[PDB]
Amino acid sequence: EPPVQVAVIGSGGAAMAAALKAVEQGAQVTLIERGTIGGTCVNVGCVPSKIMIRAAHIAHLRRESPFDGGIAATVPTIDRSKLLAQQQARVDELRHAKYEGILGGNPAITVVHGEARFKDDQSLTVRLNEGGERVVMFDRCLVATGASPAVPPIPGLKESPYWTSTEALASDTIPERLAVIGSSVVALELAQAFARLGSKVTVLARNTLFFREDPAIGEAVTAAFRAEGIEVLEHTQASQVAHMDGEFVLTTTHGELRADKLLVATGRTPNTRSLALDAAGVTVNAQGAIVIDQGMRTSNPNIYAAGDCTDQPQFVYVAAAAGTRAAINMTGGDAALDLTAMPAVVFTDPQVATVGYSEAEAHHDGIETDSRTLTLDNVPRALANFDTRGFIKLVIEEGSHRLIGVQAVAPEAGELIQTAALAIRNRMTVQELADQLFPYLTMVEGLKLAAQTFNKDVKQLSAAAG
Amino acid sequence: EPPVQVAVIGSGGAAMAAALKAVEQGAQVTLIERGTIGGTCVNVGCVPSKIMIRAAHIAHLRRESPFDGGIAATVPTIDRSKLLAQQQARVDELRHAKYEGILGGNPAITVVHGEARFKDDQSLTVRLNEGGERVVMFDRCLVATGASPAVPPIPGLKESPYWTSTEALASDTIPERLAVIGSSVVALELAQAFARLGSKVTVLARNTLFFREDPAIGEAVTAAFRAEGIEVLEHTQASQVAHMDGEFVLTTTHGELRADKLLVATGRTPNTRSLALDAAGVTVNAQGAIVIDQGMRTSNPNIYAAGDCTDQPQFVYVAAAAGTRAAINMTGGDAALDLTAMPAVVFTDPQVATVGYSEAEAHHDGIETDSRTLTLDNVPRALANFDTRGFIKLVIEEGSHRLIGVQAVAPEAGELIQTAALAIRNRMTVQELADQLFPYLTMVEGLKLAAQTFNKDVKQLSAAAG
Ligand SMILES: Cc1cc2nc3c(=O)[nH]c(=O)nc-3n(C[C@H](O)[C@H](O)[C@H](O)COP(=O)(O)OP(=O)(O)OC[C@H]3O[C@@H](n4cnc5c(N)ncnc54)[C@H](O)[C@@H]3O)c2cc1C
Ligand SMILES: Cc1cc2nc3c(=O)[nH]c(=O)nc-3n(C[C@H](O)[C@H](O)[C@H](O)COP(=O)(O)OP(=O)(O)OC[C@H]3O[C@@H](n4cnc5c(N)ncnc54)[C@H](O)[C@@H]3O)c2cc1C
Numbered sequence: 028e029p030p031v032q033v034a035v036i037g038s039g040g041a042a043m044a045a046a047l048k049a050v051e052q053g054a055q056v057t058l059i060e061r062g063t064i065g066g067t068c069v070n071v072g073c074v075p076s077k078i079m080i081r082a083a084h085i086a087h088l089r090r091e092s093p094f095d096g097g098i099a100a101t102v103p104t105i106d107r108s109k110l111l112a113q114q115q116a117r118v119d120e121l122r123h124a125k126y127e128g129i130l131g132g133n134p135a136i137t138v139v140h141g142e143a144r145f146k147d148d149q150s151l152t153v154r155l156n157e158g159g160e161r162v163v164m165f166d167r168c169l170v171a172t173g174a175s176p177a178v179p180p181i182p183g184l185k186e187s188p189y190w191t192s193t194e195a196l197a198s199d200t201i202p203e204r205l206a207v208i209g210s211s212v213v214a215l216e217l218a219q220a221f222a223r224l225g226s227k228v229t230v231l232a233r234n235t236l237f238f239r240e241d242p243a244i245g246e247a248v249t250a251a252f253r254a255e256g257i258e259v260l261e262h263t264q265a266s267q268v269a270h271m272d273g274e275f276v277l278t279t280t281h282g283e284l285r286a287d288k289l290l291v292a293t294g295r296t297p298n299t300r301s302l303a304l305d306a307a308g309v310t311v312n313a314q315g316a317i318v319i320d321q322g323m324r325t326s327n328p329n330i331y332a333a334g335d336c337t338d339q340p341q342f343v344y345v346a347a348a349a350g351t352r353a354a355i356n357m358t359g360g361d362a363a364l365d366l367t368a369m370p371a372v373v374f375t376d377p378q379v380a381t382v383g384y385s386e387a388e389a390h391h392d393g394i395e396t397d398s399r400t401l402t403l404d405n406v407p408r409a410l411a412n413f414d415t416r417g418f419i420k421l422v423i424e425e426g427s428h429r430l431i432g433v434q435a436v437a438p439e440a441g442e443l444i445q446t447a448a449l450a451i452r453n454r455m456t457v458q459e460l461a462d463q464l465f466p467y468l469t470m471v472e473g474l475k476l477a478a479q480t481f482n483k484d485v486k487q488l489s490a491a492a493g
Numbered sequence: 494e495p496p497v498q499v500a501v502i503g504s505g506g507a508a509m510a511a512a513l514k515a516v517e518q519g520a521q522v523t524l525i526e527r528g529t530i531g532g533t534c535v536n537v538g539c540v541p542s543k544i545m546i547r548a549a550h551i552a553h554l555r556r557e558s559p560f561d562g563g564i565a566a567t568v569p570t571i572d573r574s575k576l577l578a579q580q581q582a583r584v585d586e587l588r589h590a591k592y593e594g595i596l597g598g599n600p601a602i603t604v605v606h607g608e609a610r611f612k613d614d615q616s617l618t619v620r621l622n623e624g625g626e627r628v629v630m631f632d633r634c635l636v637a638t639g640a641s642p643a644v645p646p647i648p649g650l651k652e653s654p655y656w657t658s659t660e661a662l663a664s665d666t667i668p669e670r671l672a673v674i675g676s677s678v679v680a681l682e683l684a685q686a687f688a689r690l691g692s693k694v695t696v697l698a699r700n701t702l703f704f705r706e707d708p709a710i711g712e713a714v715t716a717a718f719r720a721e722g723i724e725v726l727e728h729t730q731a732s733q734v735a736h737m738d739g740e741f742v743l744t745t746t747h748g749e750l751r752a753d754k755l756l757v758a759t760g761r762t763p764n765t766r767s768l769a770l771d772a773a774g775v776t777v778n779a780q781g782a783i784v785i786d787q788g789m790r791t792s793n794p795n796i797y798a799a800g801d802c803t804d805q806p807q808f809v810y811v812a813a814a815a816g817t818r819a820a821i822n823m824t825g826g827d828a829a830l831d832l833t834a835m836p837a838v839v840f841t842d843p844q845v846a847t848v849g850y851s852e853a854e855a856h857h858d859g860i861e862t863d864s865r866t867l868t869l870d871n872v873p874r875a876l877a878n879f880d881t882r883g884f885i886k887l888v889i890e891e892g893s894h895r896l897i898g899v900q901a902v903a904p905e906a907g908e909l910i911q912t913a914a915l916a917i918r919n920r921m922t923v924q925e926l927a928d929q930l931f932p933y934l935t936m937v938e939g940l941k942l943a944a945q946t947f948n949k950d951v952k953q954l955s956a957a958a959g
């Protein structure tokens with residue numbers, strides 16, 4: 028029973044989880060990474076972005092609050108060089124501790140610095156970063172190559188000095204004027220962060236914000252953004268980009284827009300063109316994403332794929348869960364990833380959080396539904412904070428009354444969404460959820476209150492009644 | 494089938510919930526209140542305190558943050574007159590909308606302004622606020638008279654101008670120096686609020702903070718308090734209070750302590766001495782609390798009790814839940830209050846939150862346990878915030894591995910505790926909890942990470958792995 032030889036391409040959340048699990052299951056791992064160890068999350072994604080957003084939150088609350096009648100506010104001076112140094116130090120520390128140190132301190136793992144492609148379904152050719160090549164033979168291989176920022180084909184954009192999320196996060200100055208092309212998670216998390224740290228921000232949204240989500244979400248976020256001075260140009264696209272006399276000049280229907288920096292946040296495409304997937308019989312879809320089943324199996328039985336390079340949702344917790352289960356299956360087990368109560372959080376303020384079905388998604392799947400939308404001016408916590416921006420929306424199956432989805436725009440929406448996720452996992456009805464005790468003056472109490480509106484008027488119920 | 498005549502004494506969370514439910518069940522309610530409509534929660538409790546604490550939070554973050562290297566901070570000027578006006582306006586608005594307007598706009602409810610006592614088990618004598626008396630006959634009666642701040646018998650205290658929570662919340666100035674006697678929820682929520690709004694605060698704790706809770710809680714809170722300049726004198730009591738030359742002078746073992754204002758927060762005693770409970774055969778315990786079963790039944794079958802005047806936990810959500818169920822039982826039903834997954838939240842920063850059993854409580858009930866304590870320096874969200882004060886502690890039944898309690902000291906602990914409450918309600922094991930997807934970079938993810946440490950090393954696991 029020789030150790031199974033497992034090859035892993037990448038070192039992000041999917042690859043790390045797979046490598047560690049494979050080792051735990053008795054395999055010898057060869058991990059190939061072309062760039063910085065740790066991939067997107069630690070280096071240019073979740074961690075640095077959430078740090079910058081937290082800095083932004085502090086800046087914002089120093090600038091303004093619902094309590095300014097009685098607490099003086101100031102325009103705080105911002106030293107982005109110091110903020111960036113702090114951010115990078117945590118990134119570097121986490122990469123060393125949770126990635127480099129975990130791979131380096133493990134004798135069942137060989138790390139190769141190079142770019143891999145398939146030679147056949149049992150071997151990779153690696154172009155080594157120090158030059159030349161090496162062949163890596165494997166019994167099983169996990170492709171976990173992630174994704175990269177997409178670039179729309181706008182004339183003049185390619186040759187201009189524009190930013191993706193990577194360059195934005197690595198910037199050592201807050202630009203006076205920031206233009207943002209895009210209208211989803213990356214665009215809006217970063218637009219609000221930059222605005223709060225001092226930029227005059229203009230968002231060019233080709234449709235409306237969060238266009239593919241329940242429309243209540245985009246409506247609430249758009250209003251929030253406008254309320255703190257972020258310009259949101261809906262149904263607006265740039266037809267030309269130019270960079271002249273040190274600034275960006277964007278041609279749009281709304282007229283000419285000028286800015287010091289331009290962030291383009293228009294999706295992330297799977298990193299698969301360099302892999303020679305045809306050499307291993309691994310099928311992709313029209314977007315270039317590797318097609319997998321619930322066991323992370325590709326069209327080739329020796330090759331698995333996990334994370335953003337596949338057709339599954341792009342979140343680090345999905346990538347990791349998928350990597351872990353791919354490893355089980357590569358080492359003789361039988362695991363499947365279940366996404367039925369997969370929550371998602373957008374780190375704007377207020378936060379967006381979702382889990383399960385929107386009304387529209389349920390209808391498209393042939394489910395009969397009812398819903399209730401509780402505005403935050405009904406939530407004691409929001410009233411005590413004097414900030415009632417947002418809502419909590421509950422979606423149920425008609426008849427069974429089973430909770431099947433929740434969408435919320437609220438401060439701490441990301442915290443309360445997990446109570447909704449566990450309710451859905453446990454197949455609870457809204458009456459059962461409403462019957463549980465919740466602490467008074469928490470945002471999560473809003474789930475109880477929303478659940479109660481399926482049977483009675485919120486305005487006619489007394490404090491913590493239920 | 495004549496309408497059942499239900500009398501309710503009080504107008505707080507228990508009484509309101511009962512009155513409304515009784516009416517919904519077809520009864521005619523006579524509600525007797527000696528003071529301001531709405532009782533403790535709306536007027537002098539939960540609502541005004543959480544408002545003041547939120548004001549304090551803004552003041553604090555304007556003063557200091559983990560991002561001060563790159564974001565300038567100031568000592569904000571505080572106008573407590575304006576803050577108090579804002580606070581009171583929300584209190585007054587909520588009393589009108591959720592209490593007065595709900596009672597006044599209901600023809601099945603008669604409100605009597607006076608102090609009730611029992612004449613016998615079918616009638617009350619009410620001393621009317623406008624003078625004279627009235628007898629109220631009833632079929633069933635709910636006693637929901639709440640509690641009042643307790644006063645320890647310290648020489649000189651009684652005749653000094655000290656504060657309870659009521660006077661503290663109603664104060665129009667921030668005192669330069671505030672002394673606090675007490676070491677539990679009221680003392681510590683208000684001590685930190687006043688400190689953050691500008692007071693130099695000294696807490697006299699007769700033992701340690703949160704003495705009756707898992708000791709990890711008090712340790713974390715004490716450290717937090719000291720870290721922001723609140724003096725915590727453990728194992729310290731005042732043996733004499735004097736008020737001389739405009740200031741309080743407290744004699745203690747640590748020597749003489751002087752302050753401008755003194756808050757005494759040493760418990761809340763049930764309001765039952767004025768009720769003539771012996772006239773109706775209603776038994777109290779040694780503390781004066783009305784003894785009730787899970788159906789809120791007293792020793793007299795026609796008389797029920799709910800909220801802080803009983804021996805059940807003192808929270809507005811318990812009082813309301815109990816009032817609602819008492820009403821069901823007063824109108825021919827069969828309901829019981831289940832407190833097995835009753836969460837609790839303390840609105841310090843970081844928050845304290847608990848649900849279910851501590852290790853000690855489990856052991857005292859004959860349950861065999863294991864536990865894990867995850868320090869917050871292991872939680873991505875806390876690391877991204879550069880604030881790793883606190884912990885998340887999980888308690889399980891040995892063998893079954895069922896989660897039976899959670900104690901947490903963390904920002905947003907009150908939000909994440911509800912996920913723990915639902916896990917416990919649904920009888921989940923820690924492995925089952927750990928197997929659920931949680932969003933990355935939320936505080937609630939900490940529950941997943943803690944759950945995972947029952948089977949493996951946190952430090953050896955990669956980002957969002959599970
Ligand atoms: C700004 C930003 C913020 C985000 N915030 C969040 C968040 O808050 N929460 C959340 O859940 N998700 C977030 N995401 C998404 C999350 O970061 C990704 O879903 C997750 O990191 C994907 O992990 P992965 O392992 O699939 O890929 P990656 O982490 O991208 O790793 C893939 C690795 O493979 C390497 N590679 C590619 N091709 C080859 C090859 N041929 N040979 C060798 N090496 C190769 C790449 O260099 C890369 O290091 C964010 C993303 C961005 C961009
Ligand atoms: C500062 C503070 C902060 C708090 N914060 C929280 C929190 O964040 N969350 C939480 O869950 N709980 C909190 N509590 C506790 C919560 O407020 C109480 O548990 C809850 O309000 C109790 O409700 P109740 O209906 O039992 O009594 P109450 O609201 O006290 O109502 C009792 C009423 O009966 C009246 N009354 C008494 N005797 C008679 C009589 N003989 N005749 C006529 N009328 C009478 C009283 O005047 C009073 O209005 C807090 C308490 C305080 C003091």
Ligand SMILES: NC(=O)C1=CN([C@@H]2O[C@H](COP(=O)(O)OP(=O)(O)OC[C@H]3O[C@@H](n4cnc5c(N)ncnc54)[C@H](OP(=O)(O)O)[C@@H]3O)[C@@H](O)[C@H]2O)C=CC1
Nearest residue numbers: 179209210211212213214233234238292293294341372373
């Ligand atoms: N908190 C978290 O969980 C985070 C997660 N992520 C992950 O990364 C993924 C990628 O994020 P993101 O880049 O925001 O992309 P998304 O795939 O979420 O959305 C694509 C965005 O690009 C717009 N778009 C596409 N093409 C064009 C074009 N030619 N011109 C103008 N706009 C265009 C879309 O507009 P329209 O909608 O109108 O079509 C939409 O706003 C996310 O979906 C998420 O899974 C990223 C950051 C944070």
Ligand SMILES: NC(=O)C1=CN([C@@H]2O[C@H](COP(=O)(O)OP(=O)(O)OC[C@H]3O[C@@H](n4cnc5c(N)ncnc54)[C@H](OP(=O)(O)O)[C@@H]3O)[C@@H](O)[C@H]2O)C=CC1
Nearest residue numbers: 645675676677678679680699700704758759760807838839
């Ligand atoms: N967020 C929330 O849920 C809130 C809830 N409440 C509710 O109201 C209740 C009452 O709160 P609180 O007044 O804090 O009382 P608690 O009953 O929680 O605690 C009593 C406190 O008084 C101290 N004490 C008692 N006698 C003396 C004495 N002679 N000298 C010095 N100290 C003394 C105790 O010390 P030791 O512990 O050492 O014995 C302890 O600190 C709470 O238990 C809670 O149920 C109140 C505020 C907020």
